[PDB]
């Protein structure tokens, strides 16, 4: 009952393998700190912690396939795979974007349905919806922000919030 980084992948997997609903992936956004010489501030930054992808034109496909192979070094690549992948390089200043707003105000932000995502004025919600997501969720924890996405419209269930609560840290 006080989780650490070594179980984080296991807990993310547990979260959407045990889920009653059809979630496409889970992401954990870990906090880090970015000191700025210019102001002296140590701003909280949410960056990629870990993730678990479950899942379910030809030029674009060529590029994506090309990117996959390059990454292997260092068959279709679906929209949600790509979104999951592209998500790995994103980060968020505390208070900004879906994870940063979630973390700053210790919030559950539950966006269900395409219009909820496009009406949120939130950039990552908009990107998710472009890649076919219909539900996006951010839940602040003690150590960052848990995010869930799905290509289906999923209502907030108490079962899911229960599992979340048993798999991450809270104050």
């Amino acid at each position: 009952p006080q989780f650490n980084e070594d179980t984080l992948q296991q807990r993310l997997q547990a979260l959407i393998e045990s889920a009653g609903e059809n979630w496409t992936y889970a992401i954990f956004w870990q906090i880090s700190h970015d000191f700025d010489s210019s102001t002296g501030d140590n701003t909280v930054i949410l960056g990629w912690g870990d993730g678990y992808y479950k899942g379910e034109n030809t030029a674009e496909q060529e590029h994506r396939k090309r990117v996959i192979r390059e990454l292997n070094s260092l068959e279709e690549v679906t929209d949600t795979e790509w979104f999951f992948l592209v998500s790995m390089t994103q980060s968020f200043v505390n208070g900004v974007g879906l994870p940063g707003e979630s973390f700053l105000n210790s919030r559950v932000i539950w966006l269900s349905g395409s219009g909820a995502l496009t009406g949120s004025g939130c950039e990552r919600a908009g990107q998710g919806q472009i890649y076919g997501l219909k539900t996006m969720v951010c839940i602040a924890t003690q150590n960052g922000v848990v995010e869930l996405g799905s290509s289906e419209v999923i209502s907030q269930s108490s079962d899911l919030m229960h599992k979340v609560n048993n798999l991450f840290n809270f104050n």
Partner: peptide, 17 residues
Amino acid sequence: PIARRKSLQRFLEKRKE
């Protein structure tokens, strides 16, 4: 980026299946 590296690794390996 180690956190990204591990996730990337796990993602690609599971992708193979």
